[PDB]
Design a protein around this ligand. Structure first.
Ligand SMILES: Nc1nc2c(c(=O)[nH]1)N(C=O)[C@@H](CNc1ccc(C(=O)N[C@@H](CCC(=O)O)C(=O)O)cc1)CN2
Ligand SMILES: Nc1nc2c(c(=O)[nH]1)N(C=O)[C@@H](CNc1ccc(C(=O)N[C@@H](CCC(=O)O)C(=O)O)cc1)CN2
Ligand SMILES: Cc1ncc(COP(=O)(O)O)c(CNCC(=O)O)c1O
Ligand SMILES: Cc1ncc(COP(=O)(O)O)c(CNCC(=O)O)c1O
Lengths: 417, 416
C-alpha cells in the first residue's frame, strides 16, 4: 500500500525547492518564447494521474496487454476530439512529441535516402525539416528552400526546385516564420511531380483551431503538430490526415508503433483529450485572436524603435528580430533581457553569420503573455521595455529599472490564480 | 487560468474513464511483467508546472532562457542515476526505452551496419532487431536465441560474432527469465572489436538492489526504462562507465538534437524522485520479495503441469508455453482477464502463432509484490491461474476465482 499522502516536500527537499522556484519563476517572468504557453490545471491533473501505470501498446480495441478497457476510452476521446477540432478523418494521439510524430511520417512514407524538400533552419524551418544534425538530415537527401529578400516564401522558386530535384516529399511548416503559408499552392506543386505534401503545423495549431490561420489539413496528405505550443496542451505529438486511403493510415499507425515507439504515455494522452476539448471553447477562439493582435502590436513598436523584424511583420503569434546591424548576438540579447525578467530565446535568422548556439537574433511569441491576460496596451508597453534594454544593453541601471516594471506588471497578471 | 479548474466538472466523460481505471488498478491482480505502481511522489512531479518549460540542450548549455531551475532538476536526476548504478555518465532525457535505444543505435552505428541481437520470440525486445521496428529496418540484424534448455548459448553466440563480425552486440531482453553473463558478452565483443550494448530495462530495479548482475561495468553503453522494476515514471535513461568524452558527446548529441526535441521536465523531475526512492533500504527488500515471489509462482505452475520456458526464473518474470495445452496466449489472456487476473499474451521460443495471437503468456511479480503479496499469496494466486487455465471454458470456475481475487485485492490496496 502506497499512502496517497506521500509527497515530494517532506521526502526530497532538494527537488522540491527547485520545483517551487520554477513555480515562482513562471509568475515573475514575462515568457516570450514562441513555443511555450501555460497549460491548464486540468491538463496537469491528467498528467499526474494513475494512467501512468498502464502499458497499452497497440490501438484501442487491438492492444498487446490485458486490462486496457478504460485507457481505450481515454485514447478514443483524444482521437475523436482531434478529428473534430481540425476536420480530419484520421488522427494518431500516441506520438511522444513533435519530433517523434515527424519521425513516424518520414518512416511511413519514405525510404532511407529519398529526396525531401524542406525549409532550411536559419530561414525558419525546424530541426526535423532537414537539419544535418537531426535524424531527418542524416537519413534522407535534403534539398532546402528558404525565403525572399522580402522575407517570404517564393513559391515560384519552390516550384523550380521541386521540378528539378523531383523530391518524394515536400515539407511545409516552420519554427520561426511569421507569414501565412499557402498550403493549397504547395499541394499543387507537390501534385505536379507526384510528391507527398507533409505539413508540420506545430506552431500554428492553436491559431488554426480558432480559424485565425489557414488549416492545412484539407491540402496536405499528412499533418503533424505538437499539443503544447499555441494549442496550449500537454507536451506531445499528434498526427492528422484527411482523405487518405486505409493503407496510408495503416502505415502511419505502424510507423508510430511498433515502428518508432513502444508504450504510449496514457496519462499524457488523457491530457491531450481534455486540452482538445478546451480548444473547442468560444473563449479559446477570442484568445487566439488576441494572440495574433498582440504580436502585431509588438512588431509596430520594434519597427518604430528602429529594429529589423524579419519579413517586416507578422501574421501569426511570432516574429524574429534581426540584430546583425546592431552588432549584437542573440545570445547577448537573450541574457540581457533575462536579467530584466524578460525571457525569450536566441534564434538564428536568415543568412545568420553566427552558429545556432550564438545566433544574431531573438524570436518573440505572444501566446504566453496573452494567455496571461495581456492585451495590445500591455504588449506595446512590453515591447518598449525590451527595446530600452536592447538600446542600453550594458547599462545595469536600465536593466534594473525594467526588471522592477516587469515584476510589477507580473504581479497584476498572475499566471495561475 | 484559476487553480480550481479540474476535470471532474468540466469533462465528465474523461473523468469517468479515469476513475474506472483507478478502480480497475485496485480490483485487478496485475501480472504484466513490465508494469508496476509508481509512488504518489512520482505522480506529483508529473502533474507539476515543469510541463510548461522548453529546455532543449543540457544543464548550463540550453537553447532557451529561464532554465536555471529545471537545470537543477535535471542535474539531480543525472547525479542520482550515476550513483545508483555506478556510472560516470547518464542521460535522463530519453522519452522512453525505445527512444533511449534509438539514440544508442544512431550514436554508434551507420545505417546498414551489422548488429547481433536477441530474437523477439526467444525473449528479445522489438528494438533489438524486429523487422517491423526501426532497428530491423535500418540495420542488418543477425539474431540469436536460446537453447533447448531455454538459456543463452554463449558458445553459439561467439561463433555468430566471429562469423558475422557485427559492429554491435545487444544484450538484454523483454521475456527471458535467466541471468545474462554480461562479462562473458563483453569478452565476445572485445574479441571482434564490437560494442556491447546492454538494454536492462526489465531488470533495472533488481540491479539497483543488487539482486541481479549489474551490466554497467561490462557494457560500453547501457539503457533502461524507469517504469518497470525501477518503479518510476514512464521514460528512458542512458548510462555508461569508463567511456571517452567523445563517446559521451555522441550519446548526448544522438538524444538531442539527433532524435528528440524538447525534454519532458515534469517527467524528469519524476525520474529524480524515483531514483532517490530506489536508494531506500526498503527498496532492496522489495526487489528480493519480487524475485522470491516469482520463484514461488513457478513451482506451482510446474506442479500443475505447465511448461515454464527455461524451467524456472532468476528474475521477476517467466513465460508459460501453452502449445501442448492447445491454447493461444490470446485465449488464456482473455480468460484470466475475466477473473480479474491481468497478464499479457506473449510469444514463446518457436511459437507457431503470430505476435498478436501467440502460444504463451508472460507473468511478472513486480506489481503484486509492490502491493504487499508474499510467497504465500503468490503461490495461492498461481493456483487460481492454473484453475482457470484448466477449465478455460467453465464460466463457473472463472466466476469463483474472480470472487477470490476481488477478495484478496481488497486486503492489499494499491493506493490509500
Ligand atoms: N528556425 C528555428 N528556430 C528554432 C528551432 C528550430 O528547429 N528552428 N528550435 C526548435 O526546437 C530551437 C533551436 N534549436 C536548435 C538546436 C540545435 C541546433 C543546432 O544546429 N546545433 C548544432 C550546432 C550548435 C552550435 O552552434 O555550436 C549541433 O548541436 O551540433 C539548432 C537549433 C528554437 N529555435
Ligand atoms: N519477447 C517479447 N515480448 C514482448 C515484447 C517484446 O518486444 N518482446 N513487447 C514489448 O513491448 C510486448 C509485445 N509487443 C509486440 C508488438 C508488436 C509485435 C509485432 O511483431 N507485430 C507485427 C505483427 C503482428 C500480428 O501478429 O498480426 C506487426 O505489427 O506488424 C510483436 C510484439 C510484450 N511482450
Ligand atoms: C515545427 C516544429 N515541429 C516539431 C517540433 C518538435 O517538437 P518537440 O520539441 O516536442 O519534439 C517543433 C518544436 N519547436 C520548438 C521551438 O520552436 O522552440 C517545431 O517547432
Ligand atoms: C528490453 C526493453 N527495452 C525497451 C523497451 C521500450 O520501452 P518503452 O515502452 O517505454 O519504449 C522495453 C519495453 N517492453 C515492454 C514489455 O516488455 O512489455 C523493453 O522490454
Amino acid at each position: 500500500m502506497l499512502k496517497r499522502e506521500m509527497n515530494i516536500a517532506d521526502y526530497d527537499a532538494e527537488l522540491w525547492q527547485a520545483m517551487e522556484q520554477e513555480k515562482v519563476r513562471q509568475e515573475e517572468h514575462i515568457e516570450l518564447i514562441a513555443s511555450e504557453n501555460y497549460t491548464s490545471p486540468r491538463v496537469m491533473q491528467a498528467q499526474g494521474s494513475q494512467l501512468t501505470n498502464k502499458y497499452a501498446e497497440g490501438y484501442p480495441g487491438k492492444r498487446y496487454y490485458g486490462g486496457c478497457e478504460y485507457v481505450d476510452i481515454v485514447e478514443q476521446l483524444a482521437i475523436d476530439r482531434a478529428k473534430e477540432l481540425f476536420g480530419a478523418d484520421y488522427a494518431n494521439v500516441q506520438p511522444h512529441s513533435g519530433s517523434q510524430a515527424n519521425f513516424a511520417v518520414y518512416t511511413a512514407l519514405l525510404e532511407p535516402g529519398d529526396t525531401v524538400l524542406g525549409m532550411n533552419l536559419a530561414h525558419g524551418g525546424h530541426l526535423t525539416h532537414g537539419s544535418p544534425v537531426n535524424f531527418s538530415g542524416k537519413l534522407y537527401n535534403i534539398v532546402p528552400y528558404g525565403i525572399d529578400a522580402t522575407g517570404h516564401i517564393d513559391y515560384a522558386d519552390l516550384e523550380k526546385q521541386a521540378k528539378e530535384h523531383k523530391p518524394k516529399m515536400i515539407i511545409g511548416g516552420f519554427s520561426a516564420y511569421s507569414g501565412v503559408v499557402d498550403w493549397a499552392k504547395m499541394r499543387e506543386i507537390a501534385d505536379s511531380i507526384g510528391a507527398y505534401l507533409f505539413v508540420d503545423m506545430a506552431h500554428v495549431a492553436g491559431l488554426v483551431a480558432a480559424g485565425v490561420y489557414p488549416n492545412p489539413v484539407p491540402h496536405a496528405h499528412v499533418v503533424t503538430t505538437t499539443t503544447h505550443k499555441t494549442l496550449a496542451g500537454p507536451r506531445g505529438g499528434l498526427i492528422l490526415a484527411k482523405g487518405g486511403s486505409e493503407e496510408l493510415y495503416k502505415k502511419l499507425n505502424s510507423a508510430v508503433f511498433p515502428g518508432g515507439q513502444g508504450g504510449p504515455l496514457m496519462h499524457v494522452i488523457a491530457g491531450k483529450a481534455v486540452a482538445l476539448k478546451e480548444a473547442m471553447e468560444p473563449e479559446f477562439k477570442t484568445y487566439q485572436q488576441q494572440v495574433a493582435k498582440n504580436a502585431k502590436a509588438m512588431v509596430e513598436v520594434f519597427l518604430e524603435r528602429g529594429y529589423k523584424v524579419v519579413s517586416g511583420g507578422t501574421d501569426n503569434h511570432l516574429f524574429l528580430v534581426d540584430l546583425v546591424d546592431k552588432n549584437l548576438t542573440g545570445k547577448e540579447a537573450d541574457a540581457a533581457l533575462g536579467r530584466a525578467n524578460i525571457t525569450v530565446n536566441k534564434n538564428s535568422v536568415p543568412n545568420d553569420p553566427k552558429s545556432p548556439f550564438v545566433t544574431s537574433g531573438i524570436r518573440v511569441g505572444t501566446p504566453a503573455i496573452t494567455r496571461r491576460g495581456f492585451k495590445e496596451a500591455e504588449a506595446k508597453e512590453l515591447a518598449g521595455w525590451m527595446c530600452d534594454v536592447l538600446d542600453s544593453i550594458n547599462d545595469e541601471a536600465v536593466i534594473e529599472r525594467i526588471k522592477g516594471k516587469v515584476l510589477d506588471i507580473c504581479a497584476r497578471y498572475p499566471v495561475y490564480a
